[PDB]
Design a protein around this ligand. Sequence first.
Ligand SMILES: Cc1cn([C@H]2C[C@H](O)[C@@H](COP(=O)(O)OP(=O)(O)OP(=O)(O)O)O2)c(=O)[nH]c1=O
Ligand SMILES: *Nc1ccc2c(c1)Cc1ccccc1-2
Ligand SMILES: [Ca+2]
Ligand SMILES: [Ca+2]
Ligand SMILES: [Ca+2]
Length: 341
Amino acid sequence: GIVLFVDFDYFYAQVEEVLNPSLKGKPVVVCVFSGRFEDSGAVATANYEARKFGVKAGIPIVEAKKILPNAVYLPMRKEVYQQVSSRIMNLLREYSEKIEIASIDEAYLDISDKVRDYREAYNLGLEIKNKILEKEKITVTVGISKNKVFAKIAADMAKPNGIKVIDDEEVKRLIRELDIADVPGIGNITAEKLKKLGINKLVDTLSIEFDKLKGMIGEAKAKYLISLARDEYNEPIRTRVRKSIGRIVTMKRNSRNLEEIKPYLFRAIEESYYKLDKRIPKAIHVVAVTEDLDIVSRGRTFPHGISKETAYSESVKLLQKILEEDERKIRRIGVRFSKFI
DNA sequence: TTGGATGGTAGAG
DNA sequence: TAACGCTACCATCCAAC
Ligand SMILES: Cc1cn([C@H]2C[C@H](O)[C@@H](COP(=O)(O)OP(=O)(O)OP(=O)(O)O)O2)c(=O)[nH]c1=O
Ligand SMILES: *Nc1ccc2c(c1)Cc1ccccc1-2
Ligand SMILES: [Ca+2]
Ligand SMILES: [Ca+2]
Ligand SMILES: [Ca+2]
């Protein structure tokens, strides 16, 4: 069982550095500007130079500019990053047929039949890094271990431009020593609940009553953590199948005017339908983000596919439903399609 | 004598 | 002053031959 994981370094920011080499080695911040006012929106990512000053994914641009006014702030050019991603993902395909594309910049390869051992796996990781750097001038981090979770943890430890093997002995050390927060899938909310059960390390999960852990974090996550801690997790590398395709836009001003909201919604539908690429959806959900950033959605599922024209009229009724059942003003509006034929 | 649809939550982007 | 995107999972529920 040998899994090689690839995660591209500071991805959007690094693509902008390849396009404009004068950027390299100084703070670069990639932003989602939203329209609302001067510099409204959020950071998508930033290069490591900018991160030293606290700028990173998620924070508002106005806050980034407070702690790092000097940097290059660039509008996110998603189309260009997807082009670069697709070419790299096709390079990776050449090293293994068992590949799992996990995100715009992540893929797992099952190389159990390609290499005899970790030493050979490591050499293959360098070949992959070299090839990607040659073809795309993009640095990446490679993580290598016995399963997906530890391969991803290996890349986290080695980031940026790194390569790391976590061998059987180091897996045992991490079960003992790794802060549970740093386990994939364990976020702030789950971690804090675990903090209450005395669980700080993966190994702590072995001594706890299974139903107290279940009653706290739910069946799936409890099973997940115990399996990892047991050194048994062995989930297969499988092709990811798109389940939903959606778009959400920020309105210039908050509104409850249907006619004022509709153009944004239709734009979201038009854009969603372009990305569907031959897929035919049987479900549609409208999403409204209210003034206080609560997320509200209403959907409808048909026994048959939804035509683009049908989506327009159905989305209107879903938005009328939200507007009738929630009095708060809408700030963001979007649509999602799912249950593809 | 359990299940698809429903809307909300949490997080490996 | 807080984007954009998408999966897995969770409760809840109104239907159950
Ligand atoms: C986390 C995050 C990522 N992204 C996008 C931009 C990132 O470049 C891309 C990949 O996500 P990540 O791999 O999480 O981040 P990264 O590649 O920018 O940085 P790192 O070196 O630490 O791996 O996805 C967002 O748009 N918003 C986000 O909140
Ligand atoms: N990024 C993003 C885009 C569209 C949608 C979400 C996120 C959540 C959601 C829920 C219902 C419909 C559409 C969307
Ligand atoms: Ca990355
Ligand atoms: Ca990533
Ligand atoms: Ca975490």
